[PDB]
Each structure stands twice: as structure tokens, then as C-alpha cells.
A paper describes a structure:
The AmpC type class C SBLs, unlike many β-lactamases, are chromosomally encoded and present in most E. coli strains. Mutations in promoter and attenuator regions lead to hyperproduction of AmpC in pathogenic E. coli, conferring resistance to first-, second-, and third-generation cephalosporins and most penicillins, although as yet not to carbapenems. We report kinetic and structural studies, including four high-resolution crystal structures, concerning inhibition of the AmpC serine-β-lactamase from E. coli (AmpCEC) by clinically relevant DBO-based inhibitors: avibactam, relebactam, nacubactam, and zidebactam. Contrary to the proposed mechanisms of the established β-lactam SBL inhibitors, which involve essentially irreversible formation and subsequent hydrolysis of acyl-enzyme complexes, the cyclic urea carbonyl of avibactam reacts reversibly with the nucleophilic serine residue to form a carbamoyl-enzyme complex.
Residue numbers in the entry: 4 to 361
The structure:
Amino acid sequence: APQQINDIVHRTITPLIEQQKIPGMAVAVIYQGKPYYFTWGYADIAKKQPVTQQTLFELGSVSKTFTGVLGGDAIARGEIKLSDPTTKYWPELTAKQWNGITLLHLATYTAGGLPLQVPDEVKSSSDLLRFYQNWQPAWAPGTQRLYANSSIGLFGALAVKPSGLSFEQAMQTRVFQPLKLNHTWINVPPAEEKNYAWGYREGKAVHVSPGALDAEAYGVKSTIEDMARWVQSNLKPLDINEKTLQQGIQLAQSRYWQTGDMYQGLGWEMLDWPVNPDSIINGSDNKIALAARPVKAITPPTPAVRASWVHKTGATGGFGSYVAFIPEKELGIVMLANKNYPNPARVDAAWQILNALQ
Ligand SMILES: *C(=O)N1C[C@H](NOS(=O)(=O)O)CC[C@H]1C(=O)NC1CCNCC1
Ligand SMILES: [Cl-]
Ligand SMILES: [Zn+2]
Ligand SMILES: [Zn+2]
């Protein structure tokens, strides 16, 4: 790799690892459209298995960017419209509070206060229906953004219904396979388990536990090589030959809502570039990112702006992830770690690197 990339990566990530006590880490820096790979530490401490470019990490909420693009692909196929009512795809949701709640609201966390998690007691389809049927909104739809797995999670499950495919089958055939993300999994096959890093929480080795709508909201696992290719695909959608996927990527970076200097896409979040680094750093803290915040609708949604900072954070019990890219600069970064450490430290490090390479 160019010396300037090697230098800034060492001076930024090695101290981050020292500071946060991260056992293993993989980073890809995309510079002029080309990925450069870096690894540190161990995927499995006790086995002394090093992190490699083949190591699988839990992406956590970065999974939502796949969900958003799959939803955009469905829009481009004409299978769904974001203005469609939720009840069009789940007629059994007869409770009156669902009148006026659209796929757009589900996808962008603006349905009116759907909770951060689907309750852990939801283990059956019957349970899931009762959960949504009895949920009572705190606000009218389209007025407040409250980040919620139960919101975009339901969007993903309903967006694939017109295809007749399961969410996992839809994602594999329509997103993963066309983009040659051949080591990206909702469910890690047995033959690939050997590459699956352990997460570490308070010293204990852990993997994410199954839950309702997990695939849609936080359940994808991937390698640093596949995630670099994912970033390349979102930097350069015109290189994607499948027109519905090309357009789906573009639609996920459209700007549907604004709050402060932040714009809500489908999974992705965006800010204008050049960005105020303190905004993205401070705004990534859970105290802010998870707070209910008023939103202003953008009608029609702004088509993907090339001069944007596009990004997403993710976490599981034992992992911490971050992806950020700037289409106009063909510049991006993927940071995968097998410890959950605070978002602001990830974002700060990412901005130090990309700012140095602009
Ligand atoms: C996604 O990784 N999430 C959503 C939320 N934080 O959003 S983020 O952008 O700052 O990452 C909470 C943390 C995380 C999440 O929901 N993790 C689940 C916790 C419960 N067990 C399964 C994973
Ligand atoms: Cl140094
Ligand atoms: Zn040093
Ligand atoms: Zn393989």
C-alpha cells in the first residue's frame, strides 16, 4: 500500500486498539477506488487464531445497509412503493394505529415510536403479530425519528413478500450473489464456521444470539474483503450491471428525512461533505443516536448526493463495526473489531484516516 496510507493507518488504528483493548481488528481503506487491507490480533484468543482477510465478523446494525439496498432493489423492480401502507403486505395488522403507517415510515424509523428492540419474548409468528398489534405509538407517523430494529426489521420482512422469497433467499440471490459477496452470511454455514471470529465481552467469548427479525436489523456476518467490495459497490453503483440493484443502491442513499445536519436513507445515513467531524463523532454516541428527534420530510427525496459522508455503525455483544465512504472522492473505510467499543472512538478514527487521504 502507499506509504501515506500505511502511516496514517498505523498511527490511528494501533493506538485505537491500545486505547480500547481490542483483541482483533480488520480494516479496509478504499483509496481511489482500491481497497488496502490491514489486520491486527486474534479472531480466537485461546486458539491463537489470527485475524485474516477471511475472518468473519458480526456486522451488527451495519446489516441494515443490506436491508435498505434490498428494499431499494424491490422498489426498482416495481414490487413495492415506499408510500404503500404496511397493511397492504400484512393484512392481519388490523389495529387502527397502523392506519397511515407506510413502508417509508418503517424503513426510516418514523412510524411513531416503534421500540429499539423486538422483545426477547417474541419467539413465534403469533407472538410477532401480537407485539405489533398491541404497540401504541407515542407520536403521529412521519414526525419523529426513533432508531428501531423493530421498524426497519419489519420493513425488510415485508419488502420481500411480493417476490415470494424469504428474506434470506432474497438477499442471497438479489444482493450477495450479483455483487460476488461469497463470504457474507445471514447464517454461517458449518463449513465456514472455522472462519467465524469470537466476540469478546468482559473477557468472555460470545456470538450474537438469535432473535426475531435479526437478519434484517443486525444479523449479517462478513469478511473485510467482502465489506470492502460492499463499499466499492455503494461508491460506484454504475459499475453494477444489474439495473435494479444499481438503482437500489442509489435509492438507499436518497435523502428522505433531515434532522440537524444528518439525513436518513434506507439503512445508510448521510451528511454533506465536507462534514463537521464533531457532528458525526458526537452524534454516534448512543445517547444521541438512539434519542427521539423531530424530522423534516424531504419530498421528493433528494437523489443520492455524491458529495456526502455516508456511514453506518453497528454493534453486537462482542463486536463493533463502522463503515463510512465519500462517493465524490472514491474514498472509504471499513472497521471490524471483535470487541464492542464506543461508537465515537470508531468515528473519530475513521475521520482521521479519510481526512488525511482526501
Ligand atoms: C446495531 O448494531 N444496533 C442498534 C442499536 N445501536 O445502533 S448503532 O448505529 O449505534 O449501532 C443498538 C445496538 C445494536 C443492537 O441492536 N444490538 C442488539 C442488542 C441485543 N442483542 C442483539 C443485537
Ligand atoms: Cl507511531
Ligand atoms: Zn506507532
Ligand atoms: Zn470460501
